[PDB]
RNA sequence: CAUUGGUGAGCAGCGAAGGAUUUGGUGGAUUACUAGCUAAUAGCAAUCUAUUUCAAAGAAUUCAAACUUGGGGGAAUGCCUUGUUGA
């Protein structure tokens, strides 16, 4: 469903064949002046012709324990080593040591 | 203040400053328009050769840059330049004393926002004409409608609908009429960066938290979200080449690459631009090409590419990480000492507090 | 990295077996 | 693995014309 | 008739609203079968000059000649490449004479006859200019028209000059040999294409083809209709069988650099940044007159069948693969094979030419053709006289 | 003995969370930067096609036209040239 209804969009009318690029939008050779809803439907289909819809927009939506629980906490991390710890233990094999 | 013996020629040695640059196409190929204080520069993207510079230093620093096919729109203090080939063809001085924050181009219109939370509308004198010169109106954003204006974009297939995003929420206008056709509810975070999408209806928003929201308007709904731990987002871009990929540019200098189908980050670039000078200031995929042009506040402008995928059988899963391509840099700090290097006035050495020669 | 004396290699009268005077051996 | 950069040419594509969006008066 | 196993590809509009010419080559490359969609090559070799193109009469080997130094004979369908010669003299054209083993290049001064490997076989003392270098395998006759007034016929079977015919016309601006008739067609600045046989020192018949100079000429498989273009932005459709120009396409936006004819009846017109092919344009009616734009979509007025515009080029020449539905267009940086649906013939006869040929089959067929060569007096205005 | 030869051990000596070498790929410059395509005063760049076609303008050496040949011979058979013969 549309969540906003532009009442003032339909009472527009576009003469279409003045433009050199929108000549793909005419659905016959007859029509040349078209109301708002028909033109915007054609224009939406034209933008479909430009970029096809990827799979995430149409279908992937966010709106006992879940099995996505590892994946999400990976996804909200880039550094998985706990460098924010200040663990007060020493990590092995790698000395943060600076010559002074 | 005027000199008699010498005169200013250009400020040699600058690529960008951090002001969000604009991308444009001539036919199949791409140009880049960046800002340097009061003077903007134009580049081919395929070689980063300098194409044009401003005909004049502007009297105040350029705040915004948009670019349609042959016409680059600069925006300094109260006035907005319509430039062909770096030459001032039409100055559009706005009827406030408020400072021009953002700007956008669609249809027979131009739309530019000021810091009085009010956007100005500039029609073309005809659709036969090419640059917008007729002043249409001024519409505003009062504090029941939205916050401080962060961006104006036009998402495609939206007949005279203007998408004005704030730190709070998103508004839509019929700029023929001047009527608010829709207001979005507040997002609870402080929205910092907008970007349109090669899918329909979606505006991507990167907030002051590490969160990117894909947002519909025909739904009016925030369809997906994307998290980032502890980074302030600066730029968003979409790779329209042939696999759905999203570019998240921090102000920490880091560039994060997502594939929304695999719901996974691909590679995060670290430190392609200096954090103290604004981080990554603006990164944008060239439309329908696997090339992202990044721009930092360190007087640097880099290019990166995705290599085509090594997996013959898969493709989309196995992704080569982005890879360094050509770049024009400058001194990040101001230059401490210069000299004239050669005898024929070809080369100049310039050393800065950036700790480098150029 | 091209070798020096890049010469026009052409028909060898003493090595080409397509010649019927060198069709014997 | 042969990790080598390949020569990458810009190929042409198409984008939406935002200058086609306005209808005039009634 | 029913033994004919393979049928042509087609291109159909499916609507009046949907248009035939508007298809592009990346759009074509979706639906064409994988080997045939991959048979379109993009050889951008931008370093040397603009590229001259010739496929052999079987499509098995491609020969190309950039204007600066390139001479390249690839076994085109496979990855194999026979010849890659860099002569610092400038070249104009090239053709395989009998097989891919032996070819000939048209240089600054002298024609060269060449091995598959790139070795030098025969430099011609004669042929002191060489603009059009064309072959007829049915006489084993390399016929060459340089910038000279003359025209030279070398019988590379024997390896000797047959004859040399001074036209009194000047520099040769076009030459197309007739496949069906082996009469040569030379085109010069007066607007005049002369038909030629090596015996007759005056031409067989002169044709005042157009005004201005002859840009190019190209002949049917049937030898019925030869499409001639002048530099006057005009193209005539000559019916050679009664010596009439069927249609006179006047006022091109730019004069076509070349013309080419497919087997099934396609016509290729290359103004140089644009390549445009018509289907069934060579037929008798002026409804079949090839025209750029039919107003109102009238079936009588004829639209172009397939279109292409080269962006950064002004292409040199073009030639169909004779058994496949592509055409090699030689542009400044190289080679494209533009995919046609129905240009080439689908059912070749193997006993005439072999697109799928063993090397042992090749040396059988070469000796077969050399036995069946005609001596040069048999070049006539009719094959059957 | 000079080894002023290197191997080989070593050591003094240099010496900041390695040093030394070898190479693949790509990008940047290697002339002084005004944008791409087209039919170009303009349109394009999601497109030129169901205005691209009519219109005008547009045809001399009365056939000047190898400025191009390794050098000698000859040049039968061809051609060229005039002499000469018939239609």
- Contact criterion met (CB below 8 Å) for B73 and B109: no
Among B153, B357, B193, B337, CA closest to B278:
B193
Backbone angles phi, psi at A3, to 5 degrees: -90, -25
- Shortest-distance nucleotide from A99 CA to C1': F16
Name the experimental technique: cryo-EM
Alpha-carbon distance A26 to A34, whole Å?
9
The Cα-based distances of B196 to B165, B284, E221, E267 in angstroms read 11, 12, 55, 46
Show the tokens assigned to D25: 């008066």
Q: Give me the count of residues in chain A.
A: 100
Question: Which neighbouring-strand residues pair with B324?
Answer: B304
- Contact criterion met (CB below 8 Å) for E16 and E295: no
Alpha-carbon distance B18 to B31, whole Å?
17
- Contact criterion met (CB below 8 Å) for B229 and A82: no
Among E37, E91, E36, E82, CA closest to E63:
E82
Chain E contact present for C7, CB below 8 A: no
> Locate tokens 């060579």: which residue?
E282
- How many other CB atoms are there within 10 angstroms of residue E362's CB atom? 17
Backbone angles phi, psi at D20, to 5 degrees: -105, 20
Chain A contact present for E170, CB below 8 A: no
Q: Which residues contact E65 (CB under 8 A, 6 or more apart)?
A: E51, E52, E71, E72, E91, E92, E93, E94, E105, E106
Nearest CB to A22; choose among D14, D15, D20: D20
> Locate tokens 């081919």: which residue?
B44
Taking CB atoms and an 8 Å limit, are D6 and B109 in contact across chains?
no
User: What is the torsion angle, in degrees rounded to the nearest 10, for the CA atoms of residue A91, residue A92, residue A94 and residue A100?
Assistant: 70
- Shortest-distance nucleotide from B33 CA to C1': F35
Alpha-carbon distance B186 to B196, whole Å?
19
Q: Which residues contact E210 (CB under 8 A, 6 or more apart)?
A: E191, E228, E229, E230, E232, E234, E236
Chain B contact present for D26, CB below 8 A: no
Q: Reading across the β-sheet that carries E111-114, which strands appear in turn?
A: E93-96, E103-106, E111-114, E120-123
User: What is the torsion angle, in degrees rounded to the nearest 10, for the CA atoms of residue B80, residue B85, residue B86 and residue B92?
Assistant: -20
The separation, in Å, between residue B191 CA and nucleotide F27 C1' comes to 36
Alpha-carbon distance E208 to E205, whole Å?
10
Handedness of CA B265, B271, B272, B276 (dihedral sign): positive
The chains in contact with chain A, meaning 3 or more Cβ pairs closer than 8 Å, are B, D, E
Show the tokens assigned to B322: 């982005």
State how far residue B234 is from chain D, nearest Cα, in angstroms.
Answer: 24
- Contact criterion met (CB below 8 Å) for A60 and B260: yes
Q: Residue E104: exposed, middle, or buried by beta-carbon count in 10 A (0-12, 13-18, 19+)?
A: buried
Q: Is B111 left (phi over 0), alpha (psi -120 to 50) or beta?
A: beta
The H-assigned helical ranges of E260-378 are 359-371
Number of H helices, E strands in chain D: 0, 0
Q: Count C/E contacts: CB-CB distance under 8 Å.
A: 9
Taking CB atoms and an 8 Å limit, are A27 and E16 in contact across chains?
no
Taking CB atoms and an 8 Å limit, are D15 and B240 in contact across chains?
yes
Chain A contact present for D18, CB below 8 A: no
Alpha-carbon distance E275 to E337, whole Å?
12
Alpha-carbon distance E80 to E116, whole Å?
12
The H-assigned helical ranges of B103-259 are none
């Amino acid at each position: 469903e549309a969540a906003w209804i532009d009442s003032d969009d339909e009472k527009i009318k576009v003469p279409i064949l003045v433009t050199n690029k929108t000549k793909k939008l005419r659905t016959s050779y007859n029509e040349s002046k078209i109301n708002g809803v028909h033109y915007i439907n054609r224009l939406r289909s034209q933008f479909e012709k430009i970029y096809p819809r990827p799979k995430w927009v149409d279908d992937e939506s966010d709106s006992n324990g879940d099995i996505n629980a590892l994946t999400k906490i990976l996804s909200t991390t880039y550094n998985y080593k706990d460098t924010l710890s200040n663990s007060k233990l020493l990590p092995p094999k790698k000395l943060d040591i600076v010559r002074l | 203040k005027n000199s008699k013996i010498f005169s200013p020629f250009r400020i040699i040695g600058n690529v960008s400053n951090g002001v969000p640059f604009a991308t444009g196409t001539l036919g199949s190929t791409f140009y880049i328009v960046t800002c340097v204080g009061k003077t903007f520069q134009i580049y081919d993207a395929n070689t980063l050769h300098l194409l044009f510079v401003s005909e004049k230093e502007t009297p105040s620093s350029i705040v915004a840059l948009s670019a349609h096919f042959h016409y680059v729109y600069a925006a300094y203090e109260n006035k907005v330049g319509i430039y062909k080939r770096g030459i001032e063809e039409h100055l559009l001085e706005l009827e406030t004393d408020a400072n021009v924050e953002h700007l956008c181009i669609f249809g027979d219109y131009l739309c530019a926002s000021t810091d009085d939370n009010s956007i100005f509308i500039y029609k073309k004198s005809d659709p036969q004409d090419k640059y917008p010169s007729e002043f249409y109106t001024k519409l505003t954003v009062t504090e029941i409608q939205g916050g401080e204006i962060v961006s104006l974009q036009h998402l495609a297939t939206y007949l005279n609908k203007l998408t004005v995003v704030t730190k709070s929420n998103v508004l839509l206008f019929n700029v023929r009429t001047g009527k608010l056709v829709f207001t979005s509810n507040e997002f609870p975070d402080q929205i910092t960066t907008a970007e349109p999408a090669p899918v329909l209806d979606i505006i991507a928003l990167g907030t002051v938290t590490g969160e990117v929201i894909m947002f519909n308007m025909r739904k009016g709904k925030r369809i997906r979200t994307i998290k980032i731990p502890q980074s302030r987002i600066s730029s968003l871009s979409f790779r329209t080449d042939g696999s759905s990929h999203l570019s998240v540019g921090t102000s920490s200098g880091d560039l994060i690459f997502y594939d929304l189908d695999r719901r996974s980050r691909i590679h995060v670039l670290k430190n392609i631009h200096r954090e103290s000078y604004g981080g990554v200031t603006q990164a944008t995929f060239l439309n329908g090409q696997p090339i992202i042009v990044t721009s930092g506040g360190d007087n640097s402008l880099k290019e990166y590419v995705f290599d085509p995928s090594l997996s013959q059988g898969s493709g989309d899963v196995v992704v080569q990480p982005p890879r360094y391509l050509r770049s024009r840099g400058g001194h990040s700090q101001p230059p401490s000492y210069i000299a004239f290097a050669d005898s024929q006035s070809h080369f100049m050495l310039s050393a800065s507090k950036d700790r480098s020669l150029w | 990295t091209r070798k020096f004396g890049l010469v026009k290699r052409t028909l060898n009268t003493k090595k080409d077996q397509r010649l019927k005077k060198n069709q014997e051996n | 693995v042969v990790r080598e950069a390949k020569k990458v040419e810009m190929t042409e594509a198409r984008a939406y014309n935002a200058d086609a969006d306005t209808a005039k008066a009634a | 008739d029913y033994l004919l196993p393979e049928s042509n590809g087609y291109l159909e509009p499916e609507n009046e609203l949907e248009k035939t010419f508007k298809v592009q080559q990346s759009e074509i490359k979706s639906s064409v079968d994988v080997s045939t969609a991959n048979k379109a090559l993009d050889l951008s070799l931008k370093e040397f000059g603009p590229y001259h193109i010739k496929y052999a009469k079987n499509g098995t080997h491609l020969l190309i000649t950039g204007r600066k130094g390139h001479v390249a004979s690839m076994d085109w369908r496979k990855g194999q490449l026979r010849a890659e010669l860099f002569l610092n003299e400038t070249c104009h054209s090239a053709t395989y004479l009998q097989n891919e083993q032996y070819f000939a290049v048209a240089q600054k001064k002298y024609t060269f006859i060449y091995d598959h490997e790139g070795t030098e076989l025969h430099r011609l003392k004669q042929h002191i200019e060489a603009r059009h270098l064309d072959f007829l395998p049915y006489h084993y006759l390399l016929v060459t028209a340089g910038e000279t007034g003359w025209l030279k016929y070398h019988d590379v079977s024997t390896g000797q000059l047959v004859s040399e015919l001074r036209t009194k016309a000047g520099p040769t601006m076009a030459m197309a040999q007739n496949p069906w008739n082996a009469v040569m067609h030379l085109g010069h600045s007066n607007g005049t294409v002369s038909l030629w046989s090596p015996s007759m020192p005056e031409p067989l018949v002169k044709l005042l083809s157009a005004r201005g100079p002859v840009n190019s000429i190209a002949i049917d498989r049937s030898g019925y209709y030869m499409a001639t273009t002048g530099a006057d932005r005009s193209m005539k459709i000559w019916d050679i069988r009664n010596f009439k120009q069927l249609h006179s396409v006047e006022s091109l936006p730019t004069p076509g650099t070349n013309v080419s004819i497919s087997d099934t009846g396609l016509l290729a017109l290359s103004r140089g940044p644009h390549v445009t092919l018509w289907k069934d344009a060579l037929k008798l009616s002026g409804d079949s007159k090839p025209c750029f734009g039919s107003m109102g979509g009238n079936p009588h007025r004829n639209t172009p069948y397939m279109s292409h515009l080269f962006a950064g080029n002004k292409v040199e020449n073009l030639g169909f693969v004779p058994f496949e539905d592509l055409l090699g267009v030689g542009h400044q940086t190289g080679i494209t094979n533009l995919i046609v649906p129905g240009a080439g013939e689908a059912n070749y006869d193997a006993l005439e030419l072999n697109p799928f040929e063993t090397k042992k089959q090749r040396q059988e067929q070469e000796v077969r053709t050399l036995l069946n060569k005609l001596p040069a007096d048999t070049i006539t205005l009719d094959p059957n006289s």
